[PDB]
A paper describes a structure:
Antigenically sequence variable M proteins of the major bacterial pathogen [name] (Strep A) are responsible for recruiting human [name]-binding protein ([name]) to the bacterial surface, which enables Strep A to evade destruction by the immune system. M proteins form parallel, dimeric α-helical coiled coils which are attached to the bacterial cell wall and extend ∼500 Å into the extracellular space. The most sequence divergent portion of M proteins, the hypervariable region (HVR), is responsible for binding [name]. We identified [name]-binding in several M proteins that lack an M2 or M22 pattern, and determined the structures of two, M68 and [name] protein HVRs, in complex with [name]α1-2.
The structure of the complex between M87N100 and [name]α1-2 was determined by molecular replacement to 2.7 Å resolution limit. The structure revealed the same global architecture observed previously, with two [name]α1-2 molecules bound by dimeric, α-helical M87N100. The two [name] helices (aa 46–110 and 46–125) were asymmetric, with one less coiled than the other. Each [name]α1-2 molecule contacted predominantly one of the two [name] helices, which we termed the “major” helix and the other the “minor” helix. The interface was dominated by negatively charged [name] amino acids interacting with positively charged [name] ones, supplemented with a few hydrophobic contacts. The [name]α2 quadrilateral as a whole was not involved in interaction, except for R64, which formed hydrophobic contacts using its aliphatic chain with [name] Y81 of the major helix and a salt bridge with D80 of the minor helix; Y81 was the only core a or d position amino acid involved in contacts. In contrast to the [name]α2 quadrilateral, the [name]α1 Arg39 nook had the same role as previously observed in the M2 pattern, forming hydrophobic contacts and a salt bridge to [name]. Here, the former was to [name] W92 of the major helix and the latter to D96 of the minor helix. Relative to WT [name] protein, Y81A, E89A, and D96A bound [name] ∼21-fold less well on average, which indicated that the hydrophobic contact to [name] R64 and polar contacts to K63 and R39, respectively, were crucial. With LL-37, the two [name] α-helices splay apart and no longer form a coiled coil in order to accommodate α-helical LL-37, which inserts between the two [name] helices, whereas with [name], the two [name] α-helices formed a coiled coil.
Numbering used by the authors:
A (entry chain B): 1 to 18, 21 to 68, 70 to 74, 76 to 90, 92, 98 to 122
B (entry chain C): 46 to 125
C (entry chain D): 46 to 110
D (entry chain A): 0 to 16, 20 to 124
């Protein structure tokens, strides 16, 4: 018998609120805002040994590509939670964040 | 002589920088192509799952249609 | 082992080629990120069609058992 | 009120291996080697106007980036997709050992480069 499911950073339960669980229980999960389904199923399963089996079935959504006239350093990537460093009027940085059923940049481009 | 050493040291540090800027752009281009390939391969597999589901749907509606048609026939037969 | 003047003259040249390479690497990464935006869009459109199919599949199976 | 033989498609092939077709006739297709599915509807359907209705449900597969050529350059003339060709070159003072060109071809249910990266050697 399984205990509470682990806390995933990319998904939350889809039809239950957060106890113990019978073997063979299959909880359906949904990708958190800012993530997209990367596997055909999105489930956590209680195995015969009382543990939860699952892989990573969501991945970061990616913002669109950021040109600054008279002046953009992508330090990592364009994925959810990443930051770009912007010549000097405006913001010096922008982050990929959740923006209305999708992702987007926190601030638009600055004025050089 | 002292100026030449100072010039070489400056440009060596300059070339060391530009080598890192390219190396970081190279890895960023490599990771951006692997990530495309990740989705492209997942989609090719996911369409297979889509097709198996559509086949199930076609079979389901077929079994359902044959069931109501047989039920209507027996009810019409009983009425005769 | 080279002379300081000789080494600096080739480091200067190499810096020129690296600047040109980086400028090119940034057009290719731009086109790559734009490509990924498209393939990710194609993935979201798949889950839209797939979800419609599964809702229909679930309703079909419910009327049979 | 009837469709003629279906058009030949450059990106897909008919799944079935008749000359007149009734309105509503649906023929299923699959993508050609070097192509990949881009839509859910891989079918041609006979429309009431006597014409086959279909979109382009297949697009080119894409070869991965060849890699950086030591002491040389890799010229991506067009793109990295099926059918496209890249050219190789070595820097001044280096000799090219191998192929100068490579094509994105079909390689085992996928795509790959015909020739590997050459060696630029002094
Ligand atoms: K579609």
């Amino acid at each position: 018998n399984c205990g509470p499911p682990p806390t995933l950073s990319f998904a939350a339960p889809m039809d239950i609120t957060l106890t113990r669980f019978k073997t063979g229980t299959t909880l359906k999960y949904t990708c958190l805002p800012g993530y997209v389904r990367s596997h055909s199923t999105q489930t956590l399963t209680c195995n015969s040994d009382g543990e939860w089996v699952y892989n990573t079935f969501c991945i970061y959504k990616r913002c669109r590509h950021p040109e600054l006239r008279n002046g953009v350093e992508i330090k990592t990537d364009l994925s959810f939670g990443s930051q770009i460093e912007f010549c000097l009027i405006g913001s010096t940085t922008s982050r990929c964040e959740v923006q209305d059923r999708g992702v987007g940049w926190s601030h638009p481009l600055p004025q050089c | 002589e002292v100026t030449n050493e100072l010039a070489a040291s400056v440009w060596k540090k300059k070339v060391e920088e530009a080598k890192e800027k390219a190396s970081k752009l190279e890895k960023q281009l490599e990771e951006a192509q692997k990530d495309y390939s990740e989705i492209e391969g997942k989609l090719e597999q996911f369409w297979h799952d889509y097709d198996k589901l559509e086949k199930e749907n076609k079979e389901y509606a077929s079994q359902l249609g044959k069931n109501q048609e047989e039920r209507e026939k027996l009810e019409l037969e009983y009425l005769r």
